[PDB]
Design a protein around this ligand. Structure first.
Ligand SMILES: OC[C@H]1O[C@@H](O)[C@H](O)[C@@H](O)[C@H]1O
Ligand SMILES: OC[C@H]1O[C@@H](O)[C@H](O)[C@@H](O)[C@H]1O
Ligand SMILES: OC[C@H]1O[C@@H](O)[C@H](O)[C@@H](O)[C@H]1O
Ligand SMILES: OC[C@H]1O[C@@H](O)[C@H](O)[C@@H](O)[C@H]1O
Ligand SMILES: [Ca+2]
Ligand SMILES: [Ca+2]
Ligand SMILES: [Ca+2]
Ligand SMILES: [Ca+2]
Ligand SMILES: [Mn+2]
Ligand SMILES: [Mn+2]
Ligand SMILES: [Mn+2]
Ligand SMILES: [Mn+2]
Lengths: 248, 248, 248, 248
């Protein structure tokens, strides 16, 4: 069985693929733009992916990878009544480029299903886009669309660390995503069946995408403090307890 | 840093401490009694712990272990309208013996706080005991009492696998417990601050406790299909993504 | 696949089976007796095993475990021209008791093959017993006999740390043992085919055995500073890179 | 602490940086050219490195990474009396290009110390270059020169798998390299102190380099069957047991 894993407790440019406004500052992955004084700027889009492609499924053998990722993020809004747009963990084709900003989170073009995007994302959505969104802040699973196939309520705590765990089990095709705000003692969970052989190419880049608002005042930070990933592809035909010790 | 981990995809008597009705049958940990025909029996109590003690905190250094556990369980009731009582993952003192059966799950004596029990448990409670329980099936965190310090709703699916992840972070003192029913695509999550140095002895046995009803007809299986554990104790002063690959 | 591992950077009585003179002092596993002033005593025998049994092979499936262990030891002799006897890493039957002291290292009765001992050991032999030993200090593989089936020269550095790696590959039946003296930049290696299904019971205790001389003046310490173990048993049919990081 | 690891039981172009003749064929990394009939060709040079750079030391904190790698290789010569030249595991600067072929193994220019190459390599040298080589087949440690700073005898078994383990301990600055031929039950070991902060840049590519002879008839395969790597960089201040299970 082929294995790949990593743990970034601090970040570095050298092992990341940085796109647009995404930047490493003082060991922190700052996906969207912040001023020298620490003011988040509007109209920002940023992306970061790991420098090594991950084989998510094998066409010749029919094997599917089981994988898990954990990260700690922090969305900090100067004014909570007006922030946007959110951040997401995504699997994209290898040389994949950013798409629409704002509510599309740098990952999608529109609300309708476009299979040629070949993108799976778990979004953490700070802004009510209504054109497609549920009423409150939510975690969603995005398959080739910004219009999540399933969501769950997220009691987002402004400027407070969120510790995320996303797991994919090959044998049940189940994608699970959970968020914890340790300072609030709150927790949230989403689970949906996703067939990755239907959605993603055999090889993907894993990482993050985030945006700020399309208006001057709708601003927030989209920072990632730590990140851990592990994947296991069987040859023919994920120890999770040991994995979250690495990251969250 | 001292480390300990294991993964049981199948079970064996030889590395377990079996108490009361708990038994290994065909590689499955059957905590409570089942007939030769496969009929769950009432009035049953069973416990299983790992044969090696886990240091959960160090008095001399002040260090606290971070740990994670994942398991898959299956509660199967012939009649869903009348089952009891549930199963729990517990940390108990090393030579610890079973307590009250039924709604006390083999772990506690009463509803009031008794610190000398020194027991932390995450319960999966199939039965409304009301004397202390919420109205529906629930996951709860038990600290020296059967009366959980916090609960969350559990849409229990009869005879369907439940994949559980329990994590404890030393730095935030946060115990998180999540349950997934992959066949239903449902998921549930509980999080509460627990100071283990206040609750548990330095050394504990980790494992499971379960009971059937205190009436002839209130019967269910309490089976554990797989189990994974990992713990990390720093010397002075948990990679989770890699851990759940091991178990769930 | 069933997994078991641990890493002791410091030692504790609570997760060990201590036999005879073996003792934990200031986080160090002291296999043989030392005075309050730090003087090693003669005629000493000591043993330490992990509290959880390891399944080394499965009779019903025919599967054999692959395993690896790493430890750092220190043999300190007041007078190098007169020390004895050495220390060994051993796999013994579960409730196994010490045997002959001195040159037999607490593991064997005699030089002739006795299959009922069911013991595999990698010895680090400080003393020329001649009755069976090579001329100089040696690493040997012991199968049911103190008379090694294969040895290699060991340029033992008195009172200097030795970092050991022992690996067993199920698919090649190859036991490899290596010793490094980092302060000397020296290294030594032994490899021999051993069929464990022929030698060991299905379940074993893993750990250490050591002895001091059978004369007043032939004295040394037999200390173990750190210890790491991992084993993997397939269900029906070892990552050494990551192992020795955690390991050594 | 930042972590990185992988295990290739089979190979893929997508996560490798392939240079010159190096190619992936049927899941095997074939470093040097082979004909369609399976005939090794002369005058070949090939290199393969992992697509993610490894931080081997940190200038700002003074921290040095501990790392380990394990691989299985196979050198197959049609005529043993005339093969060349060998293969090596190397750490090179990130965008580093191949150097001289033949006896220089694609890694070096000459025998004299050139610090600007910034290359550490463990060589497995099939050919007596005399200009710098010991008389028989050898494992050597190469620091900025093809003239090894230390070697050891290698009883090379033609067309037989060699299982290699290379470890670097930050605290002792010790590089250890061992080779096992499981079919022969033979083993070999080399150890030397290397200060990596003196030799390598902070970031390196890890991987392999190999060459065939500079004469028509001096031909061999230089195949790598599996490969595992793990590295650990502390923030301010390696479990080998578990590593070599996943590893080898
Ligand atoms: O005002 C901020 C908002 O502006 C909308 O036009 C946009 O679609 C939203 O995603 C959000 O950015
Ligand atoms: O009838 C079944 C029930 O009986 C009650 O007396 C008991 O307290 C419950 O835990 C449950 O077992
Ligand atoms: O005096 C030292 C020696 O004494 C021998 O009789 C004994 O067999 C050796 O193992 C060694 O201990
Ligand atoms: O002919 C075989 C040999 O030829 C030499 O000139 C060369 O330096 C050696 O590396 C080897 O390839
Ligand atoms: Ca939105
Ligand atoms: Ca109850
Ligand atoms: Ca001897
Ligand atoms: Ca040469
Ligand atoms: Mn949304
Ligand atoms: Mn309850
Ligand atoms: Mn001997
Ligand atoms: Mn050479």
């Amino acid at each position: 069985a082929n294995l790949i894993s990593f743990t970034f407790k601090k970040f570095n440019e050298t092992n990341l693929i940085l796109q647009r406004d995404a930047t490493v500052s003082s060991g922190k992955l700052r996906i969207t733009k912040a001023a020298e004084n620490g003011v988040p700027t509007a109209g920002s889009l940023g992306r970061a992916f790991y420098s090594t492609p991950i084989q998510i499924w094998d066409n010749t053998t029919g094997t599917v990878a089981s994988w898990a990722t954990s990260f700690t993020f922090n969305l900090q809004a100067p004014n909570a009544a007006s922030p946007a747009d959110g951040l997401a963990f995504a699997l994209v084709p290898v040389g994949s480029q950013p798409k629409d900003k704002g509510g599309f989170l740098g990952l999608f073009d529109s609300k309708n299903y476009a299979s040629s995007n070949q993108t799976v994302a778990v979004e953490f959505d700070t802004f009510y886009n209504g054109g497609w969104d549920p009423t409150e802040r939510h975690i969603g699973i995005d398959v080739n669309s910004i219009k999540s196939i399933k969501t769950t309520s997220w009691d987002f705590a402004n400027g407070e660390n969120a510790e995320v765990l996303i797991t994919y089990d090959s044998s049940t095709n189940l994608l699970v995503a959970s968020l914890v705000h340790p300072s609030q003692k709150t927790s949230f969970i989403v689970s949906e069946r996703v067939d990755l052989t239907s959605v993603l190419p055999e090889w993907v880049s894993v990482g993050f995408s985030a945006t700020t608002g399309l208006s001057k005042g709708y601003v927030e930070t989209n920072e990632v403090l730590s990140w851990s990933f592990a994947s296991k592809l069987s040859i023919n035909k994920n120890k999770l307890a040991i994995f979250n010790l690495e990251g969250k």
